[PDB]
Amino acid sequence: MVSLPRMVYPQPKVLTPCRKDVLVVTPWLAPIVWEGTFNIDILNEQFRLQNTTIGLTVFAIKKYVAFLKLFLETAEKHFMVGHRVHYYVFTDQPAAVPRVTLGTGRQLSVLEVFCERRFLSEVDYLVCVDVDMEFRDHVGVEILTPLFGTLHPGFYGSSREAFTYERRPQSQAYIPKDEGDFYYLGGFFGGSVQEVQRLTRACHQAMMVDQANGIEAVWHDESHLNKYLLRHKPTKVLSPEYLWDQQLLGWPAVLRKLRFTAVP
Ligand SMILES: CCCCCCO[C@@H]1O[C@H](CO)[C@H](O)[C@H](N)[C@H]1O[C@@H]1O[C@@H](C)[C@@H](O)[C@@H](O)[C@@H]1O
Ligand SMILES: O=c1ccn([C@@H]2O[C@H](COP(=O)(O)OP(=O)(O)O)[C@@H](O)[C@H]2O)c(=O)[nH]1
Ligand SMILES: [Hg+2]
Ligand SMILES: [Hg+2]
Ligand SMILES: [Hg+2]
Ligand SMILES: [Hg+2]
Ligand SMILES: [Hg+2]
Ligand SMILES: [Mn+2]
């Protein structure tokens, strides 16, 4: 909307690829976010001029409340630093949520298990992630777009036939062996509030239909997420840098950074 100010940075090289080891754009022209593909200074300017507010949602039920401290502490160090952030912690143990110190312009709401309409009036984007994780490096506005999915660290190099999609035609999450772009994680997705609510509403209805027909998708919510993103292409896809497990997968050369990881 508003003009960017004068900025001094390296000129992009038309005849020099960003990365020659990985795919950086999908066949529907959605960028695949890898380190080296974006200039964060330009993106930060663009989103700050919009006074962007990002909502980060996590569920912490039962024993999972134990992961909140590290999750929030590291998010304060690496998640959208500099931008407005609103944390939404859904838990069955409100009094168990740790008292974490937040930077200015960032807030946290504890919701005991809220109106879906509230999201529309409080944030511009919603980022939904698993709580038994920790941020280890930058996770910023480069991920913001109408709808995004993240490449599962265990299948990013696999062929579609190897993807663990739901293969039973009786399930609404059914995806045949000759279909599929990528295998997306259920633990890290997001986009505009409108698109995220459309995705979760679609998933909710599809799972209800499956339940009625007495069937449960092989990987539950994640199976439906994959069906949704197959039929509604994400406008950005995040590389495995955004959700990794160093204990189980190490640190491959293809990953210049490990940004969000599983907690042992
Ligand atoms: C992080 C590397 C994990 C590779 C092992 C297979 O990971 C599982 O993949 C299926 C889909 O085929 C589901 O997505 C499971 N939820 C995955 O395992 C669980 O989540 C991954 C990220 C790991 O944290 C693993 O330890 C969990 O069991
Ligand atoms: O009793 C439970 C089970 C799961 N979760 C949430 O569901 C996410 C996914 O579950 P889990 O960690 O068990 O799955 P994994 O990533 O190991 O496949 C977790 O990160 C939690 O945020 C929760 O809050 N309470
Ligand atoms: Hg580049
Ligand atoms: Hg969400
Ligand atoms: Hg989530
Ligand atoms: Hg669902
Ligand atoms: Hg879903
Ligand atoms: Mn998890």
Ligand nearest to the CA of 232: 7
Total domains present in the chain? 1
Best probe residue, ligand 1, of 164, 167, 220, 248 (max atoms within 8 Å of C-beta): 248
Question: Which among 52, 34, 50, 162 has a CA at the least distance from the CA of 106?
Answer: 52
First to last CA, the chain: 44
Give residues (CB < 6 A) around ligand 2.
Answer: 58-62, 64, 130-132, 187
- Quote the ligand 4 centre to 176 CA distance (angstroms): 28
CB of 258 closer than 8 Å to CB of 251: yes
In degrees, rounded to 5, the angle at the alpha carbon of residue 22 between the alpha carbons of residues 17 and 28 is 85
User: Checking phi first, is residue 220 left (phi over 0); if not, alpha (psi -120 to 50) or beta?
Assistant: left
Q: Distance (Å, rounded) from C-alpha 50 to C-alpha 36? A: 24
CB of 127 closer than 8 Å to CB of 56: yes
Positive or negative, the CA dihedral 247, 250, 254, 255 is positive
Q: Per the structure block, which two tokens stand in for 73?
A: 């502490």
Query: Binding site for Mn(2+): residue ranges?
Result: 130, 132
CATH number at residue 152: 3.90.550.10
Q: Distance (Å, rounded) from C-alpha 263 to C-alpha 242? A: 14
Question: Which among 231, 225, 255, 232 has a CA at the least distance from the CA of 243?
Answer: 255
- The single-letter DSSP state of residue 3 is P
222 counts as catalytic: yes
Q: Distance (Å, rounded) from C-alpha 84 to C-alpha 82? A: 7
Q: Per the structure block, which two tokens stand in for 97?
A: 């949520």
Beta strand residue intervals within the chain, DSSP E: 32-33, 53-60, 84-91, 106-112, 125-129, 133-135, 147-150, 188-192, 236-238, 260-262
Question: Which among 109, 106, 74, 73 has a CA at the least distance from the CA of 94?
Answer: 109
Q: Distance (Å, rounded) from C-alpha 116 to C-alpha 125? A: 13
DSSP helix/strand/coil, 74:
helix
Atom 23 of ligand 2, nearest CA residue = 61
* φ/ψ of residue 225, rounded to 5: -60, -45
Q: Per the structure block, which two tokens stand in for 245?
A: 């497990």
* φ/ψ of residue 3, rounded to 5: -65, 145
- Quote the ligand 6 centre to 205 CA distance (angstroms): 7
Parent domain of 81: 1-264
Which resolution, in Å, applies to this structure? 1.8
Question: Which among 168, 159, 151, 145 has a CA at the least distance from the CA of 54?
Answer: 145
252 Cβ neighbours under 8 A, 6+ residues apart: none
User: Checking phi first, is residue 201 left (phi over 0); if not, alpha (psi -120 to 50) or beta?
Assistant: alpha
- Quote the ligand 4 centre to 246 CA distance (angstroms): 25
CB of 173 closer than 8 Å to CB of 217: yes
